[PDB]
Amino acid sequence: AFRVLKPWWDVFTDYLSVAMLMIGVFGCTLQVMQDKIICLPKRVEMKGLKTDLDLQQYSFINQMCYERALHWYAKYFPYLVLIHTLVFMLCSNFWFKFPGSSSKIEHFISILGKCFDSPWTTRALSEQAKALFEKVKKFRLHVEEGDILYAMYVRQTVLKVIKFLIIIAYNSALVSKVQFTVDCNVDIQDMTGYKNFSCNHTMAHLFSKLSFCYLCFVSIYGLTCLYTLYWLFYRSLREYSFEYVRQETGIDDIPDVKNDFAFMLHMIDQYDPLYSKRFALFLSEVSENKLKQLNLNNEWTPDKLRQKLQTNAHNRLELPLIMLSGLPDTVFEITELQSLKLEIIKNVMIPATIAQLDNLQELSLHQCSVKIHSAALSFLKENLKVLSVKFDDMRELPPWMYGLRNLEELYLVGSLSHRNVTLESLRDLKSLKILSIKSNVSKIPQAVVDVSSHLQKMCIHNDGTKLVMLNNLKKMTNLTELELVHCDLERIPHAVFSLLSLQELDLKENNLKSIEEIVSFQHLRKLTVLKLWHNSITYIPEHIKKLTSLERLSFSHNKIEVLPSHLFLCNKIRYLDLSYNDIRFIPPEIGVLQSLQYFSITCNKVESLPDELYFCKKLKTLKIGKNSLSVLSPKIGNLLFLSYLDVKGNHFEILPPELGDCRALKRAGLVVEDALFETLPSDVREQMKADA
Amino acid sequence: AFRVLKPWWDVFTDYLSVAMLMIGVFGCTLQVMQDKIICLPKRVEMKGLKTDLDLQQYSFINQMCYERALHWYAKYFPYLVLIHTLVFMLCSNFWFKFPGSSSKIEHFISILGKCFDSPWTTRALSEQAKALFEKVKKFRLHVEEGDILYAMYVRQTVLKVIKFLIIIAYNSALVSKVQFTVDCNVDIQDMTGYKNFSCNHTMAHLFSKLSFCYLCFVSIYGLTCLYTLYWLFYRSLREYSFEYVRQETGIDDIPDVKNDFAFMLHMIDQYDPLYSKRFALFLSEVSENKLKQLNLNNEWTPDKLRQKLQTNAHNRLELPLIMLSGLPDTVFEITELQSLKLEIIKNVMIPATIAQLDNLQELSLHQCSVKIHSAALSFLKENLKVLSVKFDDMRELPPWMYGLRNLEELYLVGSLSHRNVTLESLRDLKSLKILSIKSNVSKIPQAVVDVSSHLQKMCIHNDGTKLVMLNNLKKMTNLTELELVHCDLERIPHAVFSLLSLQELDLKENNLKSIEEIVSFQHLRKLTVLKLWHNSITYIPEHIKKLTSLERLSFSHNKIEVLPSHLFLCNKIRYLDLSYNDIRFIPPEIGVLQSLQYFSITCNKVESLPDELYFCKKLKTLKIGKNSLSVLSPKIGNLLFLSYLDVKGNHFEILPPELGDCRALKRAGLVVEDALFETLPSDVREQMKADA
C-alpha cells in the first residue's frame, strides 16, 4: 500500500521533485544567510572619492534601492521554486490523499497482496483461500463500477504537464531579467543628497547559474510526463485482455476486466507481470469449483459419512445427501452401502470412481441435474437395480438412464405431460420389474409398451389427470400387479379386463359408486387384491360374490349402509376393510368367511354384533372404529388368535373378564377407552399389561 | 538484507562517496562563513597611504572584484563537489531503487536466507523444507526470464567510470586556475575614484590543498571502477556452472543457471561463496526426492500400515496402497504380509529392500507405473507366485515382468488388441499354472502357448469381443480348465474339442443357442463341470446323456422352456441350476439323479412338485425361488441333509411342520415369507430358529 504503487517514471519524477526541494531549500537558506545588497551614489593621479555619509544612511539606501530596482523574481526565486516543488509533490500524492480513491486503492492492494500470498494459487497452478475468493468477487463487483480513479489520475498527469509548460515558459524569460549589477534612479536626493545609485547583491550571479541548472531539472521532469502521456494515449487502458494466461493455463474464463481494473492490471504489470499472473486465477470460477471440491473432501470424512449412513425405506444401507456442491471423494471409499440418495445437488458428474462402489443396487435423485462418466455408465447398467428420481422440469432428467438394463425397480416423481408425456423409449430396461410414476399424465405412453414384455409391477398415481387413452394399458398383459390412485375414472374402464395375469387391483381416489363391470372380472379369476380407496360406492354389486380368488378386499371411504349378505360367497377372503362407510348392521352369514383374518369398519354407524362374527376365529385384527356397540359377547374367548382389536369409540361400559382368554391380545393390541379397561378385573389386566 | 548485496568494491565506493559529501559540506560551510576576498586600489622615508574610503566602498569593491577577476571555478568548486557527490550516490543507489529489479532482488534475498537457514541442507550434505522446495522452483522458473540486472549494473559502472573520467579531465586543468593573489581593473572610477585593484581571498591556498586532497579520492574511485569493469569484462558472468558442488557432493543435477541467475550467484560468491553453496542444494531434484521420501516416512509408520493390513481375495496378508507417490520405508520393515496391492502410484522404483520381505507370494498394480531394482527383480523372480496387473494404456505395464519365472497366478486388467493382442513372449515364466485376462481381444496371442507347456488353468474374459481365431488355444496341452466368459461366441468353437484335458468349462454371456456339438464334446470324457450362463439355448439335445462325468449344470438366464427327460440319464450330477428359465413343471425323472446336492430354479414357472424330488436325499441345498408353486409336500421330511431352502415368491399359505424333520435346514436355510413361517408350530419354529 506504500511501495508497489509506483511505476518507474513515477519514481523518477519523485526523485526529481526531491532534488527540486533540495534546490529550493538551499536557495532560501543562502538567501536568508547572505541576501545583502551594496549601494553607492552614482553621479559625480587619482585619489579617494569620499562620500561623507554615515553607516545608517547606507543601510537605508541599501534597503530602499533593494526594494526599488532589483526585480521581484530575483528576490523571490527560492520561495517560488520551493512552492512549485511542493505543488508537484501534493499534486502527485493527492492520488492517495483523497479518501474516496484511497479506500478503493487500499482495498485493492490488500486483496492483491493476500491473493499473491496464497500458496493455494501455486497448488492450483501446479483452503483458507476460499474465504479470499468471496472478497475477490466482492471487490470486483463493488469497484468495477468506478473508473473515476483512472480519470482523476489522468487529470493529475495533465495538470503536471501544463504546470511544467507554464514554469518553463515564464522562467525562460525571467532568468535573463536578474543581473549582478543594477542601477537605481530613485528620488531619495534632497533627503540624502543623492539621486542615482549603483548597486549589486551577492546572490545574483549564483542564482543565475543556479537557476540555469534548475531549468534543466524541470525539462527532464517534463519529458517524463510526455512519456506517461504517450503511455496514456497509446494503450486504451479502459480495457485489458489477458489472452496469454487463458492461452497458457487453458482456462477460458477470466475473459477481461473493467476500465479501472485494466488500469490497475497494467500498472502492476509495469511493476511486475508475475503479480498479474498470480492475481489472475482467483478470478477463475473453475479454481473456486476445485477449491470447493477440496474443502468438502477435507470436511467429508468417511467416518462422517458413516455417521450419516442409515437404512433406506427398502431395507438397504443408504447415505443421505441433502445439500452438496459435488461428490466428496471419501464417499467412494465406502462401498458397502447398498443404497444412496442425493437431493438438490445440481451440476454434478459421476466419475469412473463409482467402479469402487460395487456393492450398490439402489440410487435416488431428488432434483439433481447430474451426468455421468462412460465407465460410470457401464457400472450403472451392470450394477444398479433400483432407481428413484424426483425431478421437476426434466432438467434433472438424464437421457442415459434409458440405457440402463439391470434396473428392476424404478420410481418417477415429477410431472411429464404438463398433455402427452415426453417420455423417451423404455427399450434397454431389459431387467425392469417395478415401475413407479407420480406425474400428471393423461395418456399411457408408448414407451411403456417398450418394456412390458418382462415388467411385473407398475405404479401410477396421477394428481387427477384422468387416463383418457387406454390402448397401451390393454397391452400390459405380462404385467401382474396394478394399483390406481386418484386416476379419476369414476367407473371401471374396459382396459381393466384387458389384463388377465393381474392379481392385485386398486382404484384409489377414483370416486367409484357403481362398479358393476364385475361381469368381466368373471373373466379375471386371478384377482387376489381389490382396493377401492376414496370411492363413492353406496351400491354394492352382487356379481362380486361370483369371484373365488378374492383374498383381501378394500372399500375404504365409501357410502353403502347395508351390505348384502350374499357377498359372503367369496369365502377365500382374509383381509376385509369397509371402513368410512355408512354401514349399520352385520348379517349373520358373515360367519361363513372363516378365512377372514382382518376386519376394519371404522367411521361407520355399525350397531349390531352377531356372535357369528366370532365364528371366523382366524380374525386377528378387528377394527370397528368409533361406533355405538354396547355389549362384549363371551365368544371373544372364541378368538384365541385375536392379535389386534380396535373398539375405540363404542358403548362398552364394564368390560367382562373374557379378554383373559385372549392371550394373543395384550395392552398394545387393545384399542378401547381407559375407563373401559378400568372395569376389567385384576387377572385380565395383569395378563394383558405384563406376563403376570 | 542489504549487507550481502555489496561486494568490497561497492562498499569502498560508498565510503568514498561519503567522504566526498563530507568534503563538500566542509567546503560550502567554510565558503559561507570565512570566504571573503579583501581588495585594495592598486595604482597609487615611507609613510602611510590613507585612501580615505569608508567601510562601505570597501565592501562594494570587495564584492565587485570577488565576482569579476576571481575565477568562476574557484567560487563554484564546493557546489561542483556537492553535485558530483550526489550524482554518484543517486547512481549507486539506483540499482536497488528501481522497483522492477528490486522486487526480484528481495525475493532472491528471502529465498537465499531461507535456504541457507535450512539444516536439512547440512543433513543431506552430511521436514517442512519440502514446502521450501516449491518456493525454490517457482523462484527459479520466474527469475530465469531476466538478464536486466546484469545490463543495469554494467550501465551503472559505465556511468560511474565516465563521470570519473570527466572529473579528472577538467579538474586537472582547472585546479591551477585558482590563485592566492589576483589583479582586477574594473571601471569603478567615478564610483570610488579607482580603476585598478589588488585582491586575495583567504581560502585560496586552502582550496588548492583541499582540491588536491579531493582529487586524490577521486582517483582511487576510478581505479575501483576499473577493477569491477575488468572483473565485469574478464569472466563472462552471463553463464555460471557449479562444477565443484557437482563434483564435491557427487550429484550430477543442478547443471547450470540462467544469465541473471549466473550474475546473482557470482555476486553472492564475491560476498560469500558458502551462501550460494548452501543455496545450491535446494536446486537438486534428487535432494527434493530424498526429502519427500523422508517426510513421507515421517508420516508413514509400521503401525499405520498394519492397521491397513488385511486379507485379500486369495486369503493373504495384504497391504492396500491407494494414493501414494513413493514407497514408504516402513513398508520394508513389515515382512509378515503375504500379498501387496498398489493403486494409482506412478514414478516409483522398488528397491532391493524387498529382500528383507521374503514372505511374499502375491502382488498387485492398479494403475501404477513401477520400475524395479535388479536385486529386487531377482528376488521377485525367485519369490513371487501371484500377481495382479491393472493398466489403462500399457504405459503402466513394465515388460520386465515377462522375465519372471516362479510365478503361479497372473491377472491382467486392460485392453490388449488396441488388432493384435499386445503380448510379449511368455516363455520366461517357468511356473505359471493359472492365468486370468480382462481385455477386449478377439484372438489368442501366440506367446501363451509358450507357457501352455506347463499352464494348468486359462481364463479369458473379454468385454464382448468375439474370439474369432482359436488356433493357438488348441495347442494348450497342459490346459485343464478353460473359461470363455462374455466372448460373444454364439456357437461352440471347435478348439474346445482340441483340449483333451478339459475338466471345467464356462460359456457365460456368449448367448449360444445351438449346442448340438455335444457329440464332439463326447470326445472329452473328463467334462466334470459345464457352465451355460446367459446363453440362448432354448432346448437340450439328447447327446448330453452320453457324458457321464458331468457333475454341475448351469442354465442361469437361458431360454430353456421345456426340459427333456434324457437329461436325467446322468446320475453323477450334484449341482443343477436351471434358474431364470422358462420351465413350467418338472418330470419325475429328477428322482433318479440321487447324487444331486444343489438345485436352483429361481425365476422359473414351476407350479407343482414331482414327489420324486423328495427321493434324492443328497440335495443339501434347494433354491426353488420365486415361481408359481402353491403347496409344500410333507415328503420334504425325507431329505434330512437339506440345509437350505429358497421357496420365497410362491403361492404357499401354510408350511407343514415336516420341515422340522430336516435338522440341517433351519431358519437360516428357510427362505420363506414371515406369514408363511408363522404357519409353523411354536415347537418347530423355535427348533429351527434357535435352541428353543
Swiss-Prot record, chains A, B:
Coiled coil: none annotated. LRR repeats lie at residues 288-311, 312-334, 337-357, 358-379, 381-404, 406-425, 429-451, 453-475, 476-499, 501-523, 524-547, 548-570, 572-593, 594-616, 618-639, 641-662, 664-687. Disulfide bonds join 39-199, 65-184. Its main location: membrane. It catalyses: chloride(in) = chloride(out); iodide(out) = iodide(in); taurine(out) = taurine(in); 2',3'-cGAMP(out) = 2',3'-cGAMP(in). It holds the Pfam family LRR_8. Keywords: Cell membrane, Disease variant, Disulfide bond, Dwarfism, Endoplasmic reticulum, Glycoprotein, Intellectual disability, Ion channel, Ion transport, Leucine-rich repeat, Membrane, Phosphoprotein, Repeat, Transmembrane, Transmembrane helix, Transport. It is found in: Cell membrane; Endoplasmic reticulum membrane. Residues 231-689 are cytoplasmic. GO terms for biological process: aspartate transmembrane transport; cellular response to osmotic stress; cyclic-GMP-AMP transmembrane import across plasma membrane; fat cell differentiation; intracellular signal transduction; monoatomic anion transmembrane transport; protein hexamerization; taurine transmembrane transport. Heterohexamer; oligomerizes with other LRRC8 proteins (LRRC8A, LRRC8B, LRRC8D and/or LRRC8E) to form a heterohexamer. Homoheptamer; inactive, likely because it is not targeted to the plasma membrane in the absence of LRRC8A. In vivo, the subunit composition may depend primarily on expression levels, and heterooligomeric channels containing various proportions of the different LRRC8 proteins may coexist. This is Volume-regulated anion channel subunit LRRC8C. It comes from Homo sapiens.
